[PDB]
């Protein structure tokens, strides 16, 4: 609470406002996302909530392929066409703060099982779509991602 | 802070044919030979100094760490920097003894000035 004491230059009025994010057309909650980057790379998870810090939220569900609840940036994810039903799943229980941080916090696990049950029970409504979230994804030979359709 | 510090050309200019001869030294000098290649600027030869390389008046003379340099001898001299600890940093002319350096050191941390070349002549 001193005086500036060594004079500097005050900034100018920055005219760049903060305007909300526009996701691309192919993301609506419940798409199966394939990750690209990170220890979870190339897996297949389920897209639930679009958070406020401009990242998505994804669950494995951790019961299945190993991916827990997680925040994931929009740009590093590939959006398949294969939908599911998220509608019977709760959402708002968590946001940026739930992921703020400073082993495992038993609460986190609890939420994990909560979304786990309902969501898996939804997935069982489609054939093989259980396994299709178990197996990894990878390019095979001759694959030409500029010709592919996800 | 400061802008990002850009040198425009970071490689010291050498005198034409410096290395092929010792009787010629490395301090840049012009080529007055009207036939020479370096004077007429043929492709592939060394690069003359020319004004366009002149750096950015904002960050000119700035040492990398962001301060400038100011060259002090005794403590009574660095007391001129009580005001600017955010712009100038001061270092200790070579001939200072090892007796007085340690004084400029202690007093120079109290003021909170950055001394670029501490550790000169001082062990522990």
């Amino acid at each position: 609470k001193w005086y500036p004491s060594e004079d500097v230059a005050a900034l100018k009025k920055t005219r760049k406002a903060a305007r909300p994010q526009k996701l691309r057309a192919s993301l609506v909650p419940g798409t199966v996302l394939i990750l690209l980057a990170g220890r979870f790379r190339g897996k297949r998870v389920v897209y639930l909530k679009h958070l406020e810090d401009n990242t998505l939220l994804i669950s494995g569900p951790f019961k299945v392929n190993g991916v827990p609840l997680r925040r994931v940036n929009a740009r590093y994810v590939i959006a398949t066409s294969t939908k599911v039903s998220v509608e019977g799943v709760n959402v708002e229980k968590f946001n940026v703060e739930y992921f703020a941080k400073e082993e495992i916090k038993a609460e986190r696990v609890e939420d994990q099982k909560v979304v786990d049950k309902a969501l898996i029970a939804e997935i069982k409504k489609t054939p093989l779509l259980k396994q299709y979230l178990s197996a990894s994804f990878s390019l095979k030979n001759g694959d030409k991602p500029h010709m592919l359709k996800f | 802070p400061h802008p990002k510090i850009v040198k425009k050309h970071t490689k010291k200019f050498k005198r034409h044919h410096s290395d092929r001869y010792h009787r010629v030294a490395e301090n840049w000098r012009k080529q007055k030979g009207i036939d020479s290649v370096v004077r007429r600027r043929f492709r592939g030869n060394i690069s003359q100094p020319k004004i366009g390389y002149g750096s950015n008046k904002k960050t000119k003379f700035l040492s990398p760490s962001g301060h400038k340099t100011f060259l002090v001898a005794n403590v009574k001299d660095l007391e001129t920097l009580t005001m600017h600890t955010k712009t100038y940093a001061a270092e200790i002319a070579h001939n200072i003894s090892a007796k007085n350096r340690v004084v400029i050191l202690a007093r120079a941390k109290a003021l909170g000035i950055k001394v670029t070349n501490p550790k000169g002549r001082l062990a522990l």
Binding site: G42, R75, I78, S136, S138, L139, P145 | -
Partner: protein
């Protein structure tokens, strides 16, 4: 799985060059499966990573990487100019450059 490759593969070719003066700012890249520019347009902007070995273990692993982007198309056959951060060594013309898939915008 057997094949974990998430990245298209490719070949480094040349630096951009005139007939005489090269310009080793921007490597030129050949991509496997792209025969045509409008195939390129998909790739422009992904992250190329040139990966090789160093016998002196640096960070605890001897595999090193340069990164960089892929900027714009080149030629009608679908060469694609990429610029790394630290330009590719020119030791490698015709060495396998990896083109990852992300930033992903479709």
């Amino acid at each position: 799985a057997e094949s974990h490759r998430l990245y298209v593969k490719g070949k480094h070719l040349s630096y951009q060059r005139s007939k005489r003066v090269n310009n080793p700012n921007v490597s030129l890249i050949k991509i496997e499966g792209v025969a045509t520019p409008q195939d390129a347009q998909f790739y422009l902007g992904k992250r190329i990573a040139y990966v090789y070995r160093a016998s002196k273990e640096v960070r605890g692993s001897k595999i090193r990487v340069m990164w960089g982007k892929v900027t714009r198309t080149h030629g009608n056959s679908g060469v694609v100019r990429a610029t790394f951060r630290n330009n590719l060594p020119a030791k490698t013309f015709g060495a396998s450059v990896r083109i990852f898939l992300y930033p992903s915008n479709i």
